[PDB]
UniProtKB/TrEMBL annotation:
Annotated protein name in UniProt: CRISPR-associated RAMP protein, Cmr6 family
UniProt keyword list: Antiviral defense
Signal sequence extent: none
Domain CRISPR type III-associated protein intervals: 132-274
Species annotation: Saccharolobus islandicus (strain REY15A) (Sulfolobus islandicus)
Length: 284
RNA sequence: AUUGAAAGUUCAAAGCUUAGAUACCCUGGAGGGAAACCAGACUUAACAC
């Protein structure tokens, strides 16, 4: 119902790790995309909904539609700040998940290699995925049932494989990861954030001026507020296999490829990671 | 005016009976939601002199 929508911001502020962030952002996107309408005596006349203060601020009393536009921009920034502040990491379910999965893989007689990597700068993984896409035009790869951002197993595998190509040749890359005729020997799980020092998300901006622009006459900043993954967030994922003589390349490839980027726009130093730990458990 | 003349190969009769398109068979293997992008531009007006 509509009261769900008028209260979604309060619910974000008061649950902070226990609401579905995916659906929460999807719902508050309706508020963001009907902002001018949710501010015509249709705030349910509450007292905690952040929609109140946008009746108290007078940004432009001359023209009301401009006023609603500026209020909407302020509200976009405020939604970004809200999500970054309130939605924090509780990575105990993640440690439980990875420990149980490790036991499962041990029972299946796999050699497990559990890798912990910490982000060093603000990371962008899944920038074209849907999360905040309907508010920010930019997304984060988000698992809506772990209720966490994550790094897909396919990206980790692809980055490791492109490095192993660039180093040991396409033939060894196919001897490890397979081709259209043989299946790979190395399995990757998704990477989930297990611990953090502070905020899990933070706001950021990109402001292209001269992107696909003829001349300075075409120049104009178009700022893009969006969410990123805060620094010092540790992610964890597993690497399991059976054939022993495939652990050597993996071992070598992990420390290097994380220094270079792992998500989006690493060319300007965004998605850089440190190797926090690597443990190897040989099936005995 | 012939080793001739005359004489229906005819009658009755079900290609039926029993019989499973079934058995074995992973939509799988390979594949980075990435690439590009300045949170920036600029002071103006009024009167006094």
């Amino acid at each position: 119902a509509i009261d769900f929508l008028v209260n979604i911001l309060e619910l974000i502020k008061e649950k902070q790790c226990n609401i579905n962030l995916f659906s929460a952002i999807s719902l508050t996107s309706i508020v963001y995309n009907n902002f001018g309408e949710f501010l015509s005596n249709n705030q349910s006349y509450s007292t905690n909904n952040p929609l109140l203060k946008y009746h108290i601020i007078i940004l432009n009393d001359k023209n009301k539609t401009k006023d609603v536009e500026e209020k909407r921009n302020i509200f976009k920034r405020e939604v970004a700040e809200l999500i970054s502040r309130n939605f924090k990491l509780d990575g105990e379910k993640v440690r439980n998940y990875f420990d149980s999965l490790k036991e499962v893989l041990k029972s299946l007689k796999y050699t497990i290699v559990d890798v912990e990597i910490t982000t060093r700068t603000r990371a962008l993984i899944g920038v074209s995925t849907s999360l905040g896409k309907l508010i920010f035009g930019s997304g984060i790869s988000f698992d809506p049932y772990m209720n966490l951002p994550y790094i897909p197993a396919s990206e980790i595998k692809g980055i490791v494989r492109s490095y192993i190509e660039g180093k040991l040749g396409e033939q060894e890359a196919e001897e490890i990861f397979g081709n259209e005729e043989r299946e790979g020997n190395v399995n990757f799980t998704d990477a989930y954030p297990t611990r953090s020092k502070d905020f899990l998300f933070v706001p950021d901006v990109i402001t292209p001026h001269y992107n696909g622009k003829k001349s300075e006459a075409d120049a104009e900043p178009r700022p893009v507020i969006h969410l990123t993954i805060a620094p010092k967030v540790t992610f964890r994922f597993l690497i399991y296999y059976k054939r022993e003589d495939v652990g050597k390349p993996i071992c070598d490839s992990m420390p290097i490829i994380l220094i270079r980027g792992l998500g989006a726009r690493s060319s300007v130093g965004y998605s850089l990671f440190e190797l926090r730990k690597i443990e190897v458990i040989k099936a005995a």
